[PDB]
Amino acid sequence: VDALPYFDQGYEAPGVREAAAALVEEETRRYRPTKNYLSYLTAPDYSAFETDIMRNEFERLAARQPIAWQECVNNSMAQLEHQAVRIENLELMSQHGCNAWKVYNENLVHMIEHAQKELQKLRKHIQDLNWQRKNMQLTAGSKLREMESNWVSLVSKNYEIERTIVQLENEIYQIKQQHGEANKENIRQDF
Amino acid sequence: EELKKHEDSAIPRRLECLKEDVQRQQEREKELQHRYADLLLEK
Amino acid sequence: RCSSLQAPIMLLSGHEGEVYCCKFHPNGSTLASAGFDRLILLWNVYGDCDNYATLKGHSGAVMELHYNTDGSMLFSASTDKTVAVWDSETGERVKRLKGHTSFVNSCYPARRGPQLVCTGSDDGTVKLWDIRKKAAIQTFQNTYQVLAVTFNDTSDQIISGGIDNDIKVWDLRQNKLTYTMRGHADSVTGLSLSSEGSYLLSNAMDNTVRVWDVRPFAPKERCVKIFQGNVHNFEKNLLRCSWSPDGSKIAAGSADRFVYVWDTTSRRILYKLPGHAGSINEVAFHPDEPIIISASSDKRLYMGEIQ
Amino acid sequence: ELSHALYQHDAACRVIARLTKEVTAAREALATLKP
Amino acid sequence: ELSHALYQHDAACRVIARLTKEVTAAREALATLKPQ
């Protein structure tokens, strides 16, 4: 159950690409129900339970659908009063200044600096974790290499006693009949 | 975090496989030791 | 550069003469050392409130020292020309064996423990010894003085080396040896065998550590690895090479007054440990804890630990 | 996409289990085939 | 979990494919060396 991406460098992205998704496509082709993902995303959903009301439903229908004696003095007097209020607001705004665009710009610069610091810290932590995983993968790789070499040497040691044991039975018969007491015992000699 | 988790947790499986290969290496080496020892003493 | 930091270490004093060898018990609780003072050194060691005690009775300087697999007894080879059998935990020794024509070169226990112990004398004597029978096992002579003699893990083979300038493989239970395996060269700085039994690590007086993989069963006569980089002996010295099976390591002394640590399977050594006032005569490695015993001509044993 | 990821996770786990069992079987057969 | 399952799936089937190729190579080697 231990496979490191850095363990085998020869095959990573092309290593499992086609055939892996072909077997996974064979199991998914056999059956593909939904349990853990649908059950995990089922409770929070997106917007389901709360749904709000009023402007939520009217705004949803608006989302699916991209689409006189007094009246003269009413809109006229309202235009005059609105023009006077706008003249007062422009008189104050032009009478003072701004400075808030530069202040808020400096604040946004500070926030961007904090975000960059957080990203740097996260990158540092990820780098440390990748370093530790690389060291562990190196140790396990060396141990696995020594294990495979020890297995090959073990198979060669057993095969060495095999062949030399067969030649020990043939030569056991040769010396047997030439010396070797009688031929009974040494002909039955085997590993 | 999960990669290092499962990797470090499943590393004793590979280490135990190495210990098993070393154990079989000692078994085959001992069997060859007694086999070729008796074969050398049979001369 | 080579060694890693410093780390704490324990200095063992009290040795009058230069320490000849250092060894530890199989349990790791006590460590005995031999030296030119003709007095064995028992040590409470593995952690230090104290060492153990001082052992006497050797008529001469002990050339080699080793402990039995049980731990209650130990064997030592001394210039007295008598095989030294010592019981320790009982307060007194074991027995004194005789018959050596010259000084005993080395004494080491076999896989059978007190039943038999392989030993040799500078007269060129390669002899197994039975103990509990109040007499030895058997005597043999091959070529010349054997510097070090130790039985294999199966007790059926005895490896030895010395001034004969060859690797000595000996079959025993057949009343004759095994084979003589050597390349083209003459040096002996010592002889040693790995705990796995598939290879033997011998020290070459050319300052060349020769690890030879041959092993029983299928015919090989092959080697293991060539370890170098440290000078074990400048001209003539007896160095006991003790490898550390923990991970993969090989421990040996040096004439540079530094403990010699050598990694092998990496095709390069381990580290050189300074801090010794004289050439290291022998070194040991505790199986339980990563501690090394340092025996040098400075008469101060330095036991290091890796943390 | 989470449903397709679960299908590829379970199916990829089945293919990895069968391929791992086949690799272990061929490795054991290669180890015991020498004697 | 989808990207982690995709990377762990490609690495799982990739390491299993390399183990099947090496296991088949060792099986062919040792299998062909038995009668010889």
PDB file of C-alpha atoms in Angstrom, chain A residues 23-24 27-28 32 34 36-37 155-156 158-159 162, chain D residues 2-4 6-8 11-12 15 30-31 34-35:
ATOM      1  CA  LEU A  23      -9.026  -0.805 -15.905  1.00  0.00           C
ATOM      2  CA  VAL A  24     -10.784   1.937 -13.931  1.00  0.00           C
ATOM      3  CA  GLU A  27     -14.784  -1.314 -13.304  1.00  0.00           C
ATOM      4  CA  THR A  28     -16.763   1.893 -13.861  1.00  0.00           C
ATOM      5  CA  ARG A  32     -20.753   3.114 -11.255  1.00  0.00           C
ATOM      6  CA  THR A  34     -22.554   6.848  -6.033  1.00  0.00           C
ATOM      7  CA  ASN A  36     -19.385   8.485  -0.540  1.00  0.00           C
ATOM      8  CA  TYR A  37     -19.275  11.485  -2.886  1.00  0.00           C
ATOM      9  CA  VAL A 155      18.322 -17.690  -5.248  1.00  0.00           C
ATOM     10  CA  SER A 156      21.840 -17.959  -6.681  1.00  0.00           C
ATOM     11  CA  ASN A 158      20.334 -22.230  -3.616  1.00  0.00           C
ATOM     12  CA  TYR A 159      20.911 -22.778  -7.340  1.00  0.00           C
ATOM     13  CA  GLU A 162      21.535 -27.464  -6.766  1.00  0.00           C
TER      14      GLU A 162
ATOM     15  CA  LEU D   2     -16.123  13.831  -6.748  1.00  0.00           C
ATOM     16  CA  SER D   3     -18.155  10.809  -7.869  1.00  0.00           C
ATOM     17  CA  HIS D   4     -15.746  10.161 -10.744  1.00  0.00           C
ATOM     18  CA  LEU D   6     -14.403   8.022  -5.961  1.00  0.00           C
ATOM     19  CA  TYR D   7     -14.924   5.614  -8.865  1.00  0.00           C
ATOM     20  CA  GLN D   8     -11.319   6.103  -9.995  1.00  0.00           C
ATOM     21  CA  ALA D  11     -11.258   1.061  -9.191  1.00  0.00           C
ATOM     22  CA  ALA D  12      -7.642   2.249  -9.059  1.00  0.00           C
ATOM     23  CA  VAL D  15      -6.248  -2.516 -10.002  1.00  0.00           C
ATOM     24  CA  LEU D  30      11.012 -16.062  -8.937  1.00  0.00           C
ATOM     25  CA  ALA D  31      12.439 -16.525  -5.432  1.00  0.00           C
ATOM     26  CA  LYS D  34      15.719 -21.376  -8.377  1.00  0.00           C
ATOM     27  CA  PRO D  35      15.767 -24.581  -6.268  1.00  0.00           C
TER      28      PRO D  35
END
